[PDB]
Protein backbone atom coordinates (compact mmCIF):
# COMPACT_ATOMS: atom_id res chain seq x y z
CA UNK A 1 0.00 0.00 0.00
CA UNK A 2 1.17 3.54 -0.78
CA UNK A 3 0.81 6.41 1.68
CA UNK A 4 0.18 10.05 0.84
CA UNK A 5 0.11 12.29 3.91
CA UNK A 6 -1.33 15.76 3.18
CA UNK A 7 -1.39 18.83 5.42
CA UNK A 8 -2.48 22.43 5.17
CA UNK A 9 -5.28 24.94 5.36
CA UNK A 10 -8.15 24.34 7.78
CA UNK A 11 -10.61 25.95 5.40
CA UNK A 12 -10.67 22.95 3.03
CA UNK A 13 -10.77 20.00 5.43
CA UNK A 14 -14.17 18.61 4.40
CA UNK A 15 -13.26 19.00 0.70
CA UNK A 16 -10.02 17.09 1.14
CA UNK A 17 -11.80 14.50 3.30
CA UNK A 18 -14.47 13.88 0.70
CA UNK A 19 -11.83 13.76 -2.03
CA UNK A 20 -9.96 11.12 -0.03
CA UNK A 21 -13.01 8.95 0.42
CA UNK A 22 -14.15 9.29 -3.18
CA UNK A 23 -10.68 8.66 -4.59
CA UNK A 24 -10.65 5.47 -2.50
CA UNK A 25 -13.53 4.19 -4.70
CA UNK A 26 -11.16 4.43 -7.68
CA UNK A 27 -7.89 3.33 -6.09
CA UNK A 28 -7.96 1.56 -2.75
CA UNK A 29 -4.22 0.87 -2.88
CA UNK A 30 -3.26 4.33 -1.62
CA UNK A 31 -3.88 5.58 1.89
CA UNK A 32 -4.37 9.35 1.82
CA UNK A 33 -4.81 11.46 4.95
CA UNK A 34 -5.37 15.19 5.61
CA UNK A 35 -4.16 16.96 8.74
CA UNK A 36 -5.26 20.58 8.81
CA UNK A 37 -3.15 22.80 11.10
CA UNK A 38 -2.79 25.67 8.60
CA UNK A 39 -1.20 26.63 5.27
CA UNK A 40 2.21 27.60 6.62
CA UNK A 41 2.40 24.53 8.85
CA UNK A 42 1.48 22.35 5.87
CA UNK A 43 4.24 23.80 3.70
CA UNK A 44 6.75 23.50 6.57
CA UNK A 45 5.68 19.88 7.04
CA UNK A 46 6.17 19.28 3.30
CA UNK A 47 9.74 20.58 3.44
CA UNK A 48 10.42 18.43 6.51
CA UNK A 49 9.05 15.26 4.82
CA UNK A 50 6.08 14.98 7.15
CA UNK A 51 3.68 15.58 4.23
CA UNK A 52 4.02 14.74 0.52
CA UNK A 53 1.48 17.43 -0.42
CA UNK A 54 0.57 20.72 1.26
CA UNK A 55 -2.66 22.60 0.65
CA UNK A 56 -2.34 26.38 0.99
CA UNK A 57 -4.74 29.32 0.90
CA UNK A 58 -1.85 31.77 0.57
CA UNK A 59 0.69 32.45 -2.13
CA UNK A 60 4.12 30.86 -1.94
CA UNK A 61 7.11 32.98 -1.05
CA UNK A 62 10.33 33.27 -3.04
CA UNK A 63 12.09 31.31 -0.28
CA UNK A 64 9.60 28.49 -0.70
CA UNK A 65 10.13 28.47 -4.47
CA UNK A 66 13.89 28.41 -3.89
CA UNK A 67 13.42 25.32 -1.70
CA UNK A 68 11.72 23.59 -4.63
CA UNK A 69 8.03 24.27 -3.99
CA UNK A 70 5.68 24.00 -6.94
CA UNK A 71 1.99 24.80 -7.01
CA UNK A 72 -1.20 24.12 -8.93
CA UNK A 73 -4.47 25.93 -8.21
CA UNK A 74 -7.51 23.71 -7.55
CA UNK A 75 -10.10 26.04 -5.99
CA UNK A 76 -10.94 29.66 -5.21
CA UNK A 77 -12.29 31.35 -2.10
CA UNK A 78 -13.69 34.59 -3.47
CA UNK A 79 -15.28 37.55 -1.71
CA UNK A 80 -17.58 40.20 -3.11
CA UNK A 81 -18.61 43.66 -1.99
CA UNK A 82 -22.26 44.56 -1.54
CA UNK A 83 -23.88 47.93 -0.99
CA UNK A 84 -27.23 49.36 -0.15
CA UNK A 85 -29.18 50.06 -3.32
CA UNK A 86 -29.47 53.84 -3.06
CA UNK A 87 -25.76 54.38 -3.67
CA UNK A 88 -25.60 54.58 -7.45
CA UNK A 89 -21.92 53.66 -7.70
CA UNK A 90 -21.50 50.34 -9.50
CA UNK A 91 -17.72 50.01 -9.73
CA UNK A 92 -14.69 50.67 -7.57
CA UNK A 93 -10.94 50.25 -8.01
CA UNK A 94 -9.01 48.11 -5.54
CA UNK A 95 -7.13 51.19 -4.42
CA UNK A 96 -10.28 53.13 -3.59
CA UNK A 97 -11.90 50.10 -2.01
CA UNK A 98 -8.89 49.68 0.29
CA UNK A 99 -9.15 53.35 1.26
CA UNK A 100 -12.83 52.84 2.23
CA UNK A 101 -11.78 49.83 4.28
CA UNK A 102 -9.00 51.66 6.11
CA UNK A 103 -10.98 54.84 6.69
CA UNK A 104 -9.13 57.20 4.34
CA UNK A 105 -12.39 57.51 2.37
CA UNK A 106 -15.50 58.04 4.52
CA UNK A 107 -17.98 59.82 2.28
CA UNK A 108 -19.19 58.50 -1.07
CA UNK A 109 -18.66 62.01 -2.55
CA UNK A 110 -14.90 61.60 -2.17
CA UNK A 111 -15.02 59.15 -5.08
CA UNK A 112 -17.70 61.07 -7.02
CA UNK A 113 -20.74 59.48 -5.41
CA UNK A 114 -23.53 61.16 -3.46
CA UNK A 115 -22.84 63.35 -0.45
CA UNK A 116 -23.38 60.62 2.11
CA UNK A 117 -21.22 59.28 4.91
CA UNK A 118 -20.15 55.68 4.28
CA UNK A 119 -21.43 53.11 6.76
CA UNK A 120 -18.80 50.39 6.59
CA UNK A 121 -19.99 46.97 7.78
CA UNK A 122 -17.03 44.84 8.84
CA UNK A 123 -16.66 41.24 9.92
CA UNK A 124 -15.39 40.10 13.31
CA UNK A 125 -11.61 39.94 13.50
CA UNK A 126 -11.58 36.22 14.27
CA UNK A 127 -13.26 35.34 10.96
CA UNK A 128 -11.66 33.95 7.83
CA UNK A 129 -13.36 36.63 5.77
CA UNK A 130 -11.75 39.43 7.78
CA UNK A 131 -8.37 37.73 7.39
CA UNK A 132 -8.82 37.41 3.63
CA UNK A 133 -9.79 41.05 3.10
CA UNK A 134 -6.96 42.26 5.34
CA UNK A 135 -4.45 40.10 3.46
CA UNK A 136 -5.76 40.64 -0.09
CA UNK A 137 -6.50 44.35 0.10
CA UNK A 138 -5.15 46.22 3.12
CA UNK A 139 -1.77 44.53 3.41
CA UNK A 140 -1.12 44.79 -0.34
CA UNK A 141 -2.30 48.34 -0.96
CA UNK A 142 -0.76 50.07 2.07
CA UNK A 143 2.91 50.23 2.98
CA UNK A 144 2.73 50.38 6.77
CA UNK A 145 1.00 48.32 9.45
CA UNK A 146 -0.77 51.42 10.79
CA UNK A 147 -2.24 52.23 7.36
CA UNK A 148 -3.17 48.58 6.75
CA UNK A 149 -5.74 48.51 9.53
CA UNK A 150 -9.51 48.54 9.17
CA UNK A 151 -11.49 51.72 9.87
CA UNK A 152 -12.05 51.39 13.60
CA UNK A 153 -15.68 52.51 13.72
CA UNK A 154 -16.97 49.83 11.36
CA UNK A 155 -20.29 48.13 12.23
CA UNK A 156 -19.09 44.64 13.14
CA UNK A 157 -21.14 41.52 12.37
CA UNK A 158 -20.41 37.83 12.82
CA UNK A 159 -21.60 36.07 9.67
CA UNK A 160 -22.13 36.42 5.93
CA UNK A 161 -25.90 36.36 6.38
CA UNK A 162 -25.71 39.19 8.87
CA UNK A 163 -23.64 41.33 6.49
CA UNK A 164 -26.54 41.01 4.04
CA UNK A 165 -29.17 41.82 6.65
CA UNK A 166 -27.22 44.74 8.07
CA UNK A 167 -26.53 46.18 4.59
CA UNK A 168 -30.27 45.95 3.82
CA UNK A 169 -31.05 47.95 6.97
CA UNK A 170 -28.19 50.47 7.00
CA UNK A 171 -28.24 53.42 4.64
CA UNK A 172 -25.27 54.17 2.37
CA UNK A 173 -23.56 51.00 3.50
CA UNK A 174 -20.95 48.60 2.16
CA UNK A 175 -19.88 45.15 3.37
CA UNK A 176 -18.21 41.98 2.12
CA UNK A 177 -19.42 38.41 1.81
CA UNK A 178 -18.34 35.13 0.31
CA UNK A 179 -19.16 34.60 -3.34
CA UNK A 180 -21.55 31.77 -2.39
CA UNK A 181 -23.86 34.38 -0.83
CA UNK A 182 -24.25 36.41 -4.04
CA UNK A 183 -27.66 34.93 -4.81
CA UNK A 184 -28.85 35.72 -1.28
CA UNK A 185 -27.69 39.33 -1.60
CA UNK A 186 -29.50 39.74 -4.91
CA UNK A 187 -32.73 38.20 -3.53
CA UNK A 188 -32.45 40.81 -0.75
CA UNK A 189 -32.25 43.63 -3.32
CA UNK A 190 -28.65 44.64 -2.70
CA UNK A 191 -25.99 45.59 -5.25
CA UNK A 192 -22.77 43.69 -5.92
CA UNK A 193 -19.91 45.96 -6.98
CA UNK A 194 -17.56 45.35 -9.84
CA UNK A 195 -13.92 45.71 -8.81
CA UNK A 196 -11.51 47.18 -11.37
CA UNK A 197 -14.42 47.03 -13.85
CA UNK A 198 -14.71 43.31 -13.27
CA UNK A 199 -17.68 41.37 -11.92
CA UNK A 200 -16.87 38.25 -9.90
CA UNK A 201 -17.79 35.25 -12.08
CA UNK A 202 -16.30 31.81 -12.54
CA UNK A 203 -14.57 33.08 -15.71
CA UNK A 204 -13.09 36.26 -14.25
CA UNK A 205 -12.00 34.54 -11.06
CA UNK A 206 -10.31 31.74 -13.02
CA UNK A 207 -8.55 34.27 -15.26
CA UNK A 208 -7.44 36.23 -12.18
CA UNK A 209 -9.13 39.34 -13.62
CA UNK A 210 -11.33 39.50 -10.52
CA UNK A 211 -8.87 40.18 -7.78
CA UNK A 212 -10.67 39.57 -4.45
CA UNK A 213 -10.02 35.88 -3.84
CA UNK A 214 -7.66 33.43 -2.25
CA UNK A 215 -6.25 30.84 -4.62
CA UNK A 216 -6.30 27.38 -3.00
CA UNK A 217 -3.17 25.59 -4.18
CA UNK A 218 -1.69 22.11 -4.16
CA UNK A 219 1.98 22.36 -3.20
CA UNK A 220 4.66 19.72 -3.80
CA UNK A 221 8.43 19.72 -3.55
CA UNK A 222 9.33 14.18 -9.89
CA UNK A 223 6.57 13.03 -7.59
CA UNK A 224 5.70 9.54 -6.47
CA UNK A 225 3.05 8.08 -8.76
CA UNK A 226 0.69 7.90 -5.78
CA UNK A 227 0.97 11.67 -5.36
CA UNK A 228 0.49 12.36 -9.08
CA UNK A 229 -2.60 10.17 -9.07
CA UNK A 230 -4.24 11.93 -6.15
CA UNK A 231 -3.48 15.40 -7.54
CA UNK A 232 -4.94 14.29 -10.88
CA UNK A 233 -8.12 13.35 -9.00
CA UNK A 234 -8.22 16.71 -7.17
CA UNK A 235 -8.20 18.57 -10.49
CA UNK A 236 -10.60 16.13 -12.22
CA UNK A 237 -14.25 16.97 -12.88
CA UNK A 238 -15.34 14.86 -9.88
CA UNK A 239 -12.75 16.59 -7.68
CA UNK A 240 -14.02 19.95 -8.88
CA UNK A 241 -17.65 18.95 -8.30
CA UNK A 242 -16.67 18.24 -4.69
CA UNK A 243 -15.10 21.72 -4.42
CA UNK A 244 -18.30 23.37 -5.63
CA UNK A 245 -20.65 21.15 -3.61
CA UNK A 246 -18.81 22.46 -0.56
CA UNK A 247 -19.22 26.10 -1.41
CA UNK A 248 -15.96 26.99 -3.13
CA UNK A 249 -15.35 27.82 -6.79
CA UNK A 250 -13.68 25.32 -9.11
CA UNK A 251 -11.12 25.59 -11.88
CA UNK A 252 -11.49 24.63 -15.54
CA UNK A 253 -10.82 20.96 -16.42
Curated annotation (Swiss-Prot):
It is a lipid-anchor. One of its GO terms (cellular component) is ATP-binding cassette (ABC) transporter complex. It is found in: Cell membrane. The gene is pstS. Phosphate binds at residues 9-11, 39, 127-129. Keywords: Cell membrane, Lipoprotein, Membrane, Palmitate, Phosphate transport, Signal, Transport. Binds inorganic phosphate with a Kd of 1.2 uM. Part of the ABC transporter complex PstSACB involved in phosphate import. It comes from Borreliella burgdorferi (strain ATCC 35210 / DSM 4680 / CIP 102532 / B31). SUPFAM superfamilies: Periplasmic binding protein-like II. One of its GO terms (biological process) is phosphate ion transport. This is Phosphate-binding protein PstS. Belongs to the PstS family.
Amino acid sequence: EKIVSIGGSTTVSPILDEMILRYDKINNNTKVTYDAQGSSVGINGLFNKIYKIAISSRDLTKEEIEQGAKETVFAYDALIFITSPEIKITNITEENLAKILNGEIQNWKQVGGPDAKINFINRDSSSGSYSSIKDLLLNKIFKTHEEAQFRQDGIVVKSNGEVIEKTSLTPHSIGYIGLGYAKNSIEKGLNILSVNSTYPTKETINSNKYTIKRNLIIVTNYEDKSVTQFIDFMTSSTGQDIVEEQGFLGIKT
